[PDB]
């Protein structure tokens, strides 16, 4: 049909009991009913075996015909079931060398399977059908394969392979193979001897020689040039010697003696495969009967096999795999002698069929690892992001997931790599399991996806990866390194293990392209990114860095602030200048070779060790314009692009990175593309144009969350007039005077600076009288501890409506600090409520000037009572209130309210029923507005008053002695008003910590109150909860705040909105939002 | 002050290290105790056997040099059994130093740590 497309809508693992088991050797294993009952299988009759085993999945996806959990055929005796398991070593036929060769599973040390009742019943094994009717030959022996292989050393560069025993010190190493009963005394001894060698000196009489039981098999000459010895990357010549040697008297043990003639060289044995000619006779041990040597028949032609000494508790399975195991129907031909007819080799002339003869009385249990929870990855909806995590790292992964789900609004799926292996490789670790899991969604998406649209999903490998995936090499032997779980690494091995590069791009190759297309030339369908973190501490740091990046809105305005002109100019080859504004340069990080050959191999074991994780050196350049284009490096983006291999151009010119002329072009959604997609399209574009520049074929790592967007504004806020003057291009030019009403006007534009009439919502803006500057407190001591005058005074802070791209507001300059030289600062942040889009701007055109001391006796205008309420904002004079009302009043005088104390009746006072008995000095309850010049606020809890009508007068005086009165009435009704509270922030602006003092109307009573903080986009930063009690005695409550967000990250500088809510039983009463400015973050 | 003896855990080591060596030439021979006074102002019928329950489980970095043990976050009651040995007297004064740390998650409330 061109591809496979039977991805199940629901996994088998979604229900029933599941128990993971494993093997370390191919053979028949057995599970008794007692063992099954003992592992939770209430009814053992319903249990079946599932999975693939060891032996890797094909990288040619078309060859994978199965999906979800494949049922394994099983033989069932009385109170036990049997199945043929497959270990990590598996063998294939090489028609050139007319022999069989082995293959070690790079990802696993074992073949994992599953036991489950979910089935309803086991898949009963069937009779073998391929057994031909007529045999073209009667066979007297089969080929017994054996394999000596020590996975000791792992040179990162060489390949996917590990190497064994060294001949550096020991010039002769002996390997003994046990020869088993049915081995023939005399016959041809087939041997594949694989080793690697790098000479320490040039030329010389160097030779690797093998002799079995004293008979010399071969003597291989080895040599190297002065330039080959002098090279660092050469790192050894791999050699594989095939050969059949007629041998005599091979009976109990086969002693192989490998000798390298020279001491001091870097020479290691990889493995020895040994193939003996054995009789078809049961020798008290199961036998994998295979026949390829001296074949007297053609591919697909049948042969009569006759085994003697069989115990008849023995069966013969034709088992090339676990999923294809079939019971060979035999016939008895004599005492303990059975016969069957079958093809030793397939009709394809590339397959050697395996006939496993085994005495089922001797079969024993596999390794029962235990029960596994139900799962259903197959039934998941197509997410935006897939986070594949290790166990330890899971809550830190889920934290990032929750952040992405909440802030970025997107479907994110978190899974454990174990889970992926369970549903995509029958529980066995395999790099292809990741790829298949992704492919499941890709295929699903493609079905209904419109023509032209690219696959939107992304994958985040939340974990570090080891080059030696099995952690079997000597360097890995160490409990931390051992007991840590890593994600798999995929190593793109080229033709005949010449070179190899480790890559995560493999996981994003989900198309149904043909097998002729190598891993290098296939289409990168899905963006993949990795956080090479080992421990949760590492992980939290990564996630915190990624979260804080998106939230620090002020870091993104620094790249937009570059309008004053490591700025390197790029020499390349109105509408032309517009394309260069959207351009960007990514520079590759080149992970070096820090160690003298052997060090690197013993100490640089994982991706993290190689590509040093801590996002390092200038990675992303933005090309800016006011030939040679000027480009600047901006904002510490969590992402890092890393390679080890170096890449050159025409005539060895080293490639430092790439430039995307359309990097910062916004998508249909009006947002920039995610780094993941930017890189994906980039990567995809390098193979798409590898016809003109064939020499290069670079692969690099996206180390970071692929869902990260460059913190760079989509829209900018631009002031157009300040007190009538045009501020664009001006620095400390527009003069503002103390107590002067300043009128502001501005617009909202796109990133290119074009006016955006579609932008309509609110704009938040804070005005400082100067700039933050380091100040050293001097003295006649050489040491001078220093601060930041982190109090450029806030002149004004407020919100304004933005209609059809524009806005206008005004404010009064406070009578405050103007000794500051140079410019002031206006921060602006706009939010378009409908598109949820954010705009930002910074202006330095204002400069404050000295307020001359004239018209000082002019303030004859008394303070203005802006508002004066009890409990709620909806209070008219004479309304029904409770015996302890919460008195709130906003007040205003241009020259300030007198809090001084004493000096006749100059105090702020509340005199209930014109009696000294009930006259309250409210100087201690007044809090001057840090945000609105001349404004102040009184907040007091009126002590208990008796039921009935009452009257009260608020009197407030200013510094210039002018007074004002405000009379109002209220009826006290016992238990009528709702519960409500208000809060004041001390200090404001906020530097390091914030304190919230809450006042309420129900004293001496418990109440659920909470202080809520919001950002200019309206999103809740956090909700600090508090409980009052009988122990307060009508005293306000205080809350200290460390400025940490709901995601456990410190908030950045900016305009926030604080308020408090009282969670009563019958409803929830909130207070008025109040401006909060943060400055020392 | 508390007219009792208190313990102290070596923060840097789990063991007491020593050395064996012939370098000496001969061992330092232990001497007889001299401080044993000629006349006794009292004949005593018992001594103070000290025991110590201490689990070094949690290490709040801020708090101190000390590690803390068993939590009462989930389990509200934790029992500790000390073996009492032969020469322990059936009846007598039971001296106890009980050290714990506590941060409330809500204000006020009837919270009490009780030993029995
Ligand atoms: Ca190997
Ligand atoms: Ca006045
Ligand atoms: Ca302790």
PDB file of N, CA and C in Angstrom, chain A residues 385 387 394-414 460 462 540 543 547 551 705 707 1046-1048:
ATOM      1  N   UNK A 385       3.072  19.402  22.028  1.00  0.00           N
ATOM      2  CA  UNK A 385       4.358  18.990  22.536  1.00  0.00           C
ATOM      3  C   UNK A 385       4.292  17.622  23.226  1.00  0.00           C
ATOM      4  N   UNK A 387       6.629  15.495  25.840  1.00  0.00           N
ATOM      5  CA  UNK A 387       7.794  15.540  26.716  1.00  0.00           C
ATOM      6  C   UNK A 387       8.052  14.111  27.138  1.00  0.00           C
ATOM      7  N   UNK A 394      10.519  13.343  36.073  1.00  0.00           N
ATOM      8  CA  UNK A 394       9.106  13.539  35.773  1.00  0.00           C
ATOM      9  C   UNK A 394       8.419  14.770  36.413  1.00  0.00           C
ATOM     10  N   UNK A 395       8.502  15.097  37.737  1.00  0.00           N
ATOM     11  CA  UNK A 395       7.768  16.277  38.230  1.00  0.00           C
ATOM     12  C   UNK A 395       8.335  17.536  37.625  1.00  0.00           C
ATOM     13  N   UNK A 396       9.660  17.587  37.388  1.00  0.00           N
ATOM     14  CA  UNK A 396      10.236  18.780  36.772  1.00  0.00           C
ATOM     15  C   UNK A 396       9.754  18.871  35.320  1.00  0.00           C
ATOM     16  N   UNK A 397       9.578  17.731  34.636  1.00  0.00           N
ATOM     17  CA  UNK A 397       9.030  17.748  33.292  1.00  0.00           C
ATOM     18  C   UNK A 397       7.603  18.205  33.350  1.00  0.00           C
ATOM     19  N   UNK A 398       6.835  17.642  34.278  1.00  0.00           N
ATOM     20  CA  UNK A 398       5.432  18.004  34.412  1.00  0.00           C
ATOM     21  C   UNK A 398       5.236  19.472  34.830  1.00  0.00           C
ATOM     22  N   UNK A 399       6.205  20.066  35.525  1.00  0.00           N
ATOM     23  CA  UNK A 399       6.143  21.474  35.890  1.00  0.00           C
ATOM     24  C   UNK A 399       6.187  22.322  34.616  1.00  0.00           C
ATOM     25  N   UNK A 400       7.179  22.046  33.730  1.00  0.00           N
ATOM     26  CA  UNK A 400       7.304  22.721  32.433  1.00  0.00           C
ATOM     27  C   UNK A 400       6.041  22.492  31.629  1.00  0.00           C
ATOM     28  N   UNK A 401       5.514  21.234  31.660  1.00  0.00           N
ATOM     29  CA  UNK A 401       4.274  20.898  30.963  1.00  0.00           C
ATOM     30  C   UNK A 401       3.154  21.805  31.449  1.00  0.00           C
ATOM     31  N   UNK A 402       2.937  21.842  32.771  1.00  0.00           N
ATOM     32  CA  UNK A 402       1.907  22.681  33.383  1.00  0.00           C
ATOM     33  C   UNK A 402       2.087  24.138  33.023  1.00  0.00           C
ATOM     34  N   UNK A 403       3.339  24.636  33.000  1.00  0.00           N
ATOM     35  CA  UNK A 403       3.600  26.023  32.611  1.00  0.00           C
ATOM     36  C   UNK A 403       3.120  26.248  31.167  1.00  0.00           C
ATOM     37  N   UNK A 404       3.537  25.353  30.242  1.00  0.00           N
ATOM     38  CA  UNK A 404       3.179  25.420  28.821  1.00  0.00           C
ATOM     39  C   UNK A 404       1.689  25.315  28.666  1.00  0.00           C
ATOM     40  N   UNK A 405       1.052  24.369  29.364  1.00  0.00           N
ATOM     41  CA  UNK A 405      -0.404  24.197  29.338  1.00  0.00           C
ATOM     42  C   UNK A 405      -1.110  25.498  29.758  1.00  0.00           C
ATOM     43  N   UNK A 406      -0.695  26.080  30.898  1.00  0.00           N
ATOM     44  CA  UNK A 406      -1.330  27.285  31.416  1.00  0.00           C
ATOM     45  C   UNK A 406      -0.973  28.555  30.646  1.00  0.00           C
ATOM     46  N   UNK A 407       0.317  28.907  30.513  1.00  0.00           N
ATOM     47  CA  UNK A 407       0.733  30.165  29.880  1.00  0.00           C
ATOM     48  C   UNK A 407       0.633  30.154  28.367  1.00  0.00           C
ATOM     49  N   UNK A 408       1.303  29.229  27.716  1.00  0.00           N
ATOM     50  CA  UNK A 408       1.304  29.158  26.259  1.00  0.00           C
ATOM     51  C   UNK A 408       0.026  28.527  25.694  1.00  0.00           C
ATOM     52  N   UNK A 409      -0.881  28.060  26.558  1.00  0.00           N
ATOM     53  CA  UNK A 409      -2.128  27.460  26.124  1.00  0.00           C
ATOM     54  C   UNK A 409      -1.986  26.279  25.188  1.00  0.00           C
ATOM     55  N   UNK A 410      -1.264  25.232  25.547  1.00  0.00           N
ATOM     56  CA  UNK A 410      -1.214  24.211  24.525  1.00  0.00           C
ATOM     57  C   UNK A 410      -1.230  22.775  25.061  1.00  0.00           C
ATOM     58  N   UNK A 411      -1.772  21.852  24.222  1.00  0.00           N
ATOM     59  CA  UNK A 411      -1.885  20.441  24.560  1.00  0.00           C
ATOM     60  C   UNK A 411      -0.487  19.897  24.645  1.00  0.00           C
ATOM     61  N   UNK A 412      -0.051  19.478  25.838  1.00  0.00           N
ATOM     62  CA  UNK A 412       1.278  18.858  25.974  1.00  0.00           C
ATOM     63  C   UNK A 412       1.083  17.506  26.636  1.00  0.00           C
ATOM     64  N   UNK A 413       1.727  16.461  26.057  1.00  0.00           N
ATOM     65  CA  UNK A 413       1.673  15.066  26.521  1.00  0.00           C
ATOM     66  C   UNK A 413       2.980  14.686  27.195  1.00  0.00           C
ATOM     67  N   UNK A 414       2.934  14.301  28.489  1.00  0.00           N
ATOM     68  CA  UNK A 414       4.138  13.869  29.202  1.00  0.00           C
ATOM     69  C   UNK A 414       4.087  12.339  29.336  1.00  0.00           C
ATOM     70  N   UNK A 460      10.241  16.931  23.100  1.00  0.00           N
ATOM     71  CA  UNK A 460      11.266  17.353  24.033  1.00  0.00           C
ATOM     72  C   UNK A 460      11.774  16.134  24.783  1.00  0.00           C
ATOM     73  N   UNK A 462      13.346  15.030  27.682  1.00  0.00           N
ATOM     74  CA  UNK A 462      13.630  15.580  28.997  1.00  0.00           C
ATOM     75  C   UNK A 462      14.559  14.621  29.723  1.00  0.00           C
ATOM     76  N   UNK A 540      15.501  21.309  37.252  1.00  0.00           N
ATOM     77  CA  UNK A 540      14.796  22.486  37.744  1.00  0.00           C
ATOM     78  C   UNK A 540      15.461  23.722  37.209  1.00  0.00           C
ATOM     79  N   UNK A 543      14.327  24.314  33.554  1.00  0.00           N
ATOM     80  CA  UNK A 543      12.926  24.712  33.457  1.00  0.00           C
ATOM     81  C   UNK A 543      12.773  26.133  33.987  1.00  0.00           C
ATOM     82  N   UNK A 547      11.280  29.140  31.909  1.00  0.00           N
ATOM     83  CA  UNK A 547      10.099  29.885  32.394  1.00  0.00           C
ATOM     84  C   UNK A 547      10.416  31.358  32.561  1.00  0.00           C
ATOM     85  N   UNK A 551       8.725  34.952  30.859  1.00  0.00           N
ATOM     86  CA  UNK A 551       8.063  35.881  31.751  1.00  0.00           C
ATOM     87  C   UNK A 551       8.789  37.204  31.880  1.00  0.00           C
ATOM     88  N   UNK A 705      14.067  23.617  25.029  1.00  0.00           N
ATOM     89  CA  UNK A 705      12.658  23.312  24.762  1.00  0.00           C
ATOM     90  C   UNK A 705      12.342  23.805  23.325  1.00  0.00           C
ATOM     91  N   UNK A 707       9.561  24.322  22.009  1.00  0.00           N
ATOM     92  CA  UNK A 707       8.427  25.222  22.100  1.00  0.00           C
ATOM     93  C   UNK A 707       8.831  26.677  22.546  1.00  0.00           C
ATOM     94  N   UNK A1046       3.513  31.748  40.881  1.00  0.00           N
ATOM     95  CA  UNK A1046       2.806  30.494  41.084  1.00  0.00           C
ATOM     96  C   UNK A1046       3.619  29.307  40.551  1.00  0.00           C
ATOM     97  N   UNK A1047       4.520  29.505  39.551  1.00  0.00           N
ATOM     98  CA  UNK A1047       5.381  28.428  39.031  1.00  0.00           C
ATOM     99  C   UNK A1047       6.730  28.354  39.788  1.00  0.00           C
ATOM    100  N   UNK A1048       6.866  29.093  40.912  1.00  0.00           N
ATOM    101  CA  UNK A1048       8.067  29.065  41.752  1.00  0.00           C
ATOM    102  C   UNK A1048       9.303  29.651  41.113  1.00  0.00           C
TER     103      UNK A1048
END
